[PDB]
Symmetry: C3
Subunit: 263 residues, 3 copies
Amino acid sequence: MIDKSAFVHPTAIVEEGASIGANAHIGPFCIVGPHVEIGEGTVLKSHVVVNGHTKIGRDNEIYQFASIGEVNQDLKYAGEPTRVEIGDRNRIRESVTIHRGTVQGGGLTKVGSDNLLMINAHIAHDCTVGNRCILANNATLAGHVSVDDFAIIGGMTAVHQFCIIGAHVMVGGCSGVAQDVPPYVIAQGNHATPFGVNIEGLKRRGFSREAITAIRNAYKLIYRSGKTLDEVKPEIAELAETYPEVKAFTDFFARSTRGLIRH
Amino acid sequence: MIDKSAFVHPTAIVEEGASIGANAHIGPFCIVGPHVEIGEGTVLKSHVVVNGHTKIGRDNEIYQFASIGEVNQDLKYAGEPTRVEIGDRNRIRESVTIHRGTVQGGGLTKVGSDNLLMINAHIAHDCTVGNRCILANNATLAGHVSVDDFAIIGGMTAVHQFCIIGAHVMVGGCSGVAQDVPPYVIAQGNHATPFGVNIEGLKRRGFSREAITAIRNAYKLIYRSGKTLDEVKPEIAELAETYPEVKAFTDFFARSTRGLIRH
Amino acid sequence: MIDKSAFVHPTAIVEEGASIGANAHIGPFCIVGPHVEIGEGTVLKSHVVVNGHTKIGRDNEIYQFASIGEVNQDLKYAGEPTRVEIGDRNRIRESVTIHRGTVQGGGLTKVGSDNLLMINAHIAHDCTVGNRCILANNATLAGHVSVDDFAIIGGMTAVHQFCIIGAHVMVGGCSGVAQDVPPYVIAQGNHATPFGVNIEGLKRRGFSREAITAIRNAYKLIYRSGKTLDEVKPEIAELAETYPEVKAFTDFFARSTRGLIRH
Ligand SMILES: CCCCCCCCCCC[C@@H](O)CC(=O)O[C@H]1[C@H](O)[C@@H](CO)O[C@H](OP(=O)(O)OP(=O)(O)OC[C@H]2O[C@@H](n3ccc(=O)[nH]c3=O)[C@H](O)[C@@H]2O)[C@@H]1NC(C)=O
Ligand SMILES: CCCCCCCCCCC[C@@H](O)CC(=O)O[C@H]1[C@H](O)[C@@H](CO)O[C@H](OP(=O)(O)OP(=O)(O)OC[C@H]2O[C@@H](n3ccc(=O)[nH]c3=O)[C@H](O)[C@@H]2O)[C@@H]1NC(C)=O
Ligand SMILES: CCCCCCCCCCC[C@@H](O)CC(=O)O[C@H]1[C@H](O)[C@@H](CO)O[C@H](OP(=O)(O)OP(=O)(O)OC[C@H]2O[C@@H](n3ccc(=O)[nH]c3=O)[C@H](O)[C@@H]2O)[C@@H]1NC(C)=O
Ligand SMILES: COc1ccccc1C[C@@H]1COCCN1C(=O)c1cc(-c2cc(C)ccn2)n[nH]1
Ligand SMILES: COc1ccccc1C[C@@H]1COCCN1C(=O)c1cc(-c2cc(C)ccn2)n[nH]1
Ligand SMILES: COc1ccccc1C[C@@H]1COCCN1C(=O)c1cc(-c2cc(C)ccn2)n[nH]1
C-alpha cells in the first residue's frame, strides 16, 4: 500500500504490493518490487532499483544508480526468497549495492541505522552492518562479513568473507582485510595488520579516560604480552569486571572464526 | 528484427535495426542501438545501455547500470566501427563496462560463455575473456588483456595492458598484475608474484592426480630450477609429450609478450 | 533557457531555469536541475544526473550513470548552495561522480578542460582538477585535493584529503597517495613514494632537453642531496632564474600543506 502522503514520480515503476510510507519520495526512473517496504520519509533520488523481500526504514536517503535487495553474487544462490533489512537515517550513495541473503548463510542481509555508505560501497549477501558505520568509496565486503557499530572502512578497501570488523575499528584505505579485527583497533595494510587503539574515535564518542586506558591494556594483552589468545581471554574477562567496555573483546572473541589480524 | 516472443518494456528504447531473439527480455529504461544483436532468452534487467556493433549470445543476464559495447577509453580511438562479441550464459552484474575494440588492436573485444563479471568489473577495448572466468567486484582490465578459460581475478585487482592471465589461474584480490601469468598459477600482490599451482581449482575441475603432478613439475622448472625460460621451454615441451595438460604452458609462452611474473 | 538548437530527449527531465546551449544534446532519462548550465555542443549520453549550482562548458562528453553537481559526502555539509565548475572538451565516463563544494572548503569544486575522467573516477567536494589530466578507472580523490595540469593518476589509486598532485606528475595504479607530490615526479606505492622525473611525459609535451635536465637537477636537490627542504628551496629558486620550468617547484611548495612524499 502506498501512503496518500508519499510522492511517486510518474516515471517510477512501483509494483503492486510494495509498501511506501508517509512522506516518502520515489524519484524519476526508480523501480520498486512488490515485496519492498519503504519507511516514512525515505527518499529514492532517481534511477534506484529496489527489489526482493526488502524492508527499508525511515528517513533514509538513497542516491541514483544504487541497487538494493538485488540477487547476490554467490554462485550457490539459486533464487530462494531471502531478505534485506535496512534501518533508519542511512545515507546510501550513488551506485551502492546491497544484496539479498542466501539460505546457506541465514537468509538475511542486514544494515542498521545512521550509516554512511559512500559511492560504490558493496554489502554482499548475509553481511551484517551495525549502526553509525562508514564505508568509504569502493569499500567492498565479501559475503557474511560483520561490520560492527561505529566501525569505519577506508576508500578502496576490501574485506574477505566471514571476517568481523569489530566495534569502533578504523580500517585504513587501500587495505585488504583477511582476518578478524578486534573492537577498538586501527588496522591498515595488505593484508591489514593492527596499529594500536583507535583512541581519537573513542575520545570523540564519549569514552572515559579510564575506559580508554583499560582498552589499551587489553590491546597490550592481545598483541604485546607474548601470550596466546587462550591465555589472555580470562585476563581480558578479569579486566572487564572493572571496566565494562572491555567486555566488547570477550563478545567479539566468541564470534570470531578467522583468527585475529596480527603483525 | 524483434522476435514476436521477445518482451520489450514500453520505456525501453530499441533502435530500428536491432535484433532481439526469441524470449529475450529488455527491461525498463534500457537503450539498445541499431547494430546490437541480443540472443534468445537474454535478459537486460533495467537501465542497461547496449550500443555499437555488438553481438550478445543466449541466456545472458545483464544487470542494471551496465554499459556494453560503449566507446572505449583509448585516446587513440577515433570512432571507427569496431566490435564486441559476448557468448552465452554470462552473468554480467551491476555497472559492468565492456567496451568496443580499436582498429589498432584488432577491432574486437570478446567475452566467451558461462562467465561471472561482478559489480563494476571492466573489460577494456581489445580484451579477450574466455569461458567460465570470474572477475570479482571492481576487477579492472586495461586494453588488450587476455583472461583465459577458468581464470579468476579477485576483488579490487587491476591488470596492466596486454598482459595474459593464463588458463585456470587464480589472481588474489587487492593485486596489481604487470606481467603475464602462466596457466595453472596462483598470483597475488602489488605487483603480483607467483605462489605455486592452483591445485584446488584443478582438483575441482577434474584434472587427474598425474596431470596435477606434471603441472607442479612444470611450475618447478619455471620458478625453482634456476634455469632461464629459454632452457626450460624444451623441457616443458618434453614433459607435455606424456601429460597433454602441460602443453598449455607451451601455448601460453607463444602468446606471452610481457615476460612472466616472478618472485 | 534552452537554446532552440539544443536537443532534449522527450524522456529527459530538464527543470525550468536550466540553461542549455546551442547544439547541446540531453539524452534519454537524464535529469538536469534548475541551476545547471550546459555549454554549447556538450552531450549527456543518457541516464546522467546533473544538479546543484553547476556550470559545464562546451563540447563535453558525459556518459551514462555519471552524477555531476551532487551533494558531497562530507558529514560537515548541511545543504548550503555550493558550486561545481567544469570547463571544455572533457570526456567524463560512465559512473563518474563530481560533487559540489562545502562552505568550509571554499564553496567550489572545479574541473578544467581537455581532461579524461575514466569509469567511476571520483572528484570530491572542493577538489581542483586542472587541464589535460587523466584519472583512470576508480581513481578516487578525497575532499580538497588538487590535481594540477597534465597530471595522470592510475587505475584503482586513491588520494588522501588536501594532497596536491603536482603538474605533469604520473601516479601509478594501485597506489595510495598520502602526501603532496611535487611537479614532474613519478609516484607509486602504498603509500606512494617518488621514483624520479616523468621524463617521457615532459619529452612528449615539448619540454626542452635543457629544461628536463634542470628539472632532474631540482629533483636531485629535493631527494638526493640530503639537505632539508628549507635549505633546497632557495637553491631551487636560484636554478629557476635560468630555467623557468623549475619555478613550478617554488609555486608548488607555497601551496603544499602535507609535506612531500618521500622514500
Ligand atoms: C585481501 C582480501 C581481498 C577481499 C576481496 C573480496 C571481494 C568481494 C566482492 C563481493 C563478492 C560477494 O558479493 C559475493 C561473495 O563473496 O560470494 C562468495 C561467498 O561469500 C562465499 C561464502 O559463502 O562462497 C563463494 O566464495 P568461495 O571462494 O568460498 O567459493 P568457491 O569455493 O565456489 O570458489 C569460487 C571459485 O574459485 C575457484 N577456486 C577456489 C579455490 C581455489 O583454491 N582455487 C580456485 O580456483 C573455484 O573453482 C570456483 O570457481 C562465493 N563466491 C562465488 C564466486 O560464488
Ligand atoms: C599495477 C597495474 C595497474 C593497472 C591499472 C590498469 C587500469 C586500467 C583501466 C581501464 C583502461 C582501459 O579502458 C583503456 C586503456 O587501457 O587504454 C590504453 C591502451 O590500452 C594502451 C594500449 O593501446 O594505450 C594507451 O595507454 P598508454 O599508457 O600506452 O598511452 P600513452 O602512451 O598515450 O600515454 C598515456 C598518457 O600518459 C602520459 N605518459 C606516458 C608515459 C610516461 O612515461 N609518462 C607519461 O606522463 C602521456 O603523456 C599520455 O598523456 C591507452 N590509454 C590512454 C589514456 O589512451
Ligand atoms: C592511502 C590513502 C587512502 C585515501 C582514501 C580516500 C578515499 C576518499 C573517498 C571520497 C571521499 C570524499 O567524497 C569525501 C571526503 O573526503 O570527506 C572528508 C573531508 O574531505 C574531510 C576534510 O574536510 O573531512 C572529513 O574527513 P575527516 O576524516 O577529516 O573527518 P572526521 O574528523 O569527521 O572523521 C570521520 C570519522 O572518522 C572517525 N575517526 C576519526 C579519527 C580517528 O582517529 N578515528 C576515528 O574513528 C570519526 O569518529 C568520524 O566518525 C570528510 N569525511 C567524512 C566522513 O565526513
Ligand atoms: C583515516 O580516515 C578514514 C579511515 C577510514 C574510513 C574513513 C576515513 C575518513 C577519510 C576521509 O573521509 C572520506 C573517507 N576517508 C578515507 O577513506 C581515508 C582513508 C585514509 C587513509 C590515510 C592513510 C594515511 C592511511 C590509510 N587510509 N585517508 N582517507
Ligand atoms: C581467493 O578467492 C578468490 C580469488 C580470486 C577470484 C575470486 C575469489 C572468490 C572470492 C569470494 O567470492 C567473491 C570473490 N572473492 C574474492 O575476490 C576474494 C579474493 C580474496 C583474497 C583473499 C586472500 C587471503 C588473499 C587475496 N585475495 N578473498 N576473496
Ligand atoms: C603507467 O601508465 C599510466 C599511469 C597513470 C595514469 C594513466 C596511465 C595509462 C595506463 C593505460 O591507459 C589506461 C590507464 N593506465 C593505468 O591506469 C595504468 C597504470 C599502470 C601501472 C603499471 C605499473 C607497472 C605500475 C603502476 N601502474 N598501468 N596502467
